[PDB]
Amino acid sequence: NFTLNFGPQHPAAHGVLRLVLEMNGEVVERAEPHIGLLHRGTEKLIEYKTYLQALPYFDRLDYVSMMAQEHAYSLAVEKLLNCEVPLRAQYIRVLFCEITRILNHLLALTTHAMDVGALTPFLWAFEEREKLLEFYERVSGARMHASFIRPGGVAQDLPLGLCRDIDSFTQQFASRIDELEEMLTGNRIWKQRLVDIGTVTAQQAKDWGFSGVMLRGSGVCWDLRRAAPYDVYDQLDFDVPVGTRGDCYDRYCIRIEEMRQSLRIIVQCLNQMPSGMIKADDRKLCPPSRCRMKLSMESLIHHFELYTEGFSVPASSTYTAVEAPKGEFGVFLVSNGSNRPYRCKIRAPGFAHSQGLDFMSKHHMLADVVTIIGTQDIVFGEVDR
């Protein structure tokens, strides 16, 4: 058999994808993904930064789901600090994590359908993506890389009209999802290009470290928001969709259902969000108000010490994982008692999913390899740090 190379440099498929395929005829026999083109030394750069200075690195890991990584990093720091977060901050974090989940799912579904050949749903979904990123631009000052979720509480408070605008969005996102489904779900070509492609058994998913939609499509009811709940996720009502055949079509139906349930969670968070402060009151770990630093001596001392040295995490090590839109995103943070992390491994779900591309694509058509790559929803920011 010959040795064929797909390097798509154009971001019509990821952009830094490099597959070296061994094709017998039209079937592919082994898929070896060549990674390392987006390895920017993020893990080593964390060890040279303060715990506050290393927060923006997590925005650029999974650049389609930004708040998901910040939530995990903040939870790891809180676990190593035993820092309690106010209820309003927890509700805001859950709200902006479920907005993030919808953003990631909307991008993934349509960048996967564009690979197949469906161009129309891509623009329709990016319209709602822009509508959602407007909310990102409102709380923070950045459309994508918002350093909003922070270890103590949250960076700053919500503008006045944000809740009303988010409710107005949720009044029509259901019809938007209905249109997006009606363009793809009933189509026979979409069924023929997804059904029975990429079948994975539950044992294979467990052995290869699959998580999220890749794992729940095989029948495994494993959600980290229900197995190891964090924040206020245990006070919210939402269902966990589970697949039956493990193919690419189940990964798509579940990726629809997880976004409808995300809309449901967003509505509940809007309705039940309480009043109060948005940051922990231990100003030894959180910044003082700008009116208090210019009027009180100890507040100014705290500001000065926090914005140069930052806080010091007691010597310990732990692993915290959250339910990122791709799957289980974990951070292994090691502290030696100083103001800089000693070691911080980033466990990316894409790393464990692109590794299993070899067995998912074996004995499949060449044109069926792009659907297998797109159904895993891989971004290379996290695959190679």
Partner: protein
């Protein structure tokens, strides 16, 4: 008037007359939009300079 450096511009503002022996300088009418509060002792003959603003305060009567 770009030819005037900020030093020359802050050297042209007349000192503020204060009746008491001490004045508090915040840097702006709205406290939250200025610099940290600075208490200046007006017990000399030369005008007393704010170390943030550069504004000068002088005692009015005594």
């Amino acid at each position: 008037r770009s030819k005037k450096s900020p030093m020359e511009l802050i050297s042209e503002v007349p000192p503020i007359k204060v009746d008491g022996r001490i004045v508090a300088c915040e840097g702006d009418t709205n406290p939250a939009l200025g610099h940290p509060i600075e208490f200046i002792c007006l017990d000399l003959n030369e005008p007393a300079i704010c170390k943030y603003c550069g504004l000068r305060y002088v005692q009015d009567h005594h």
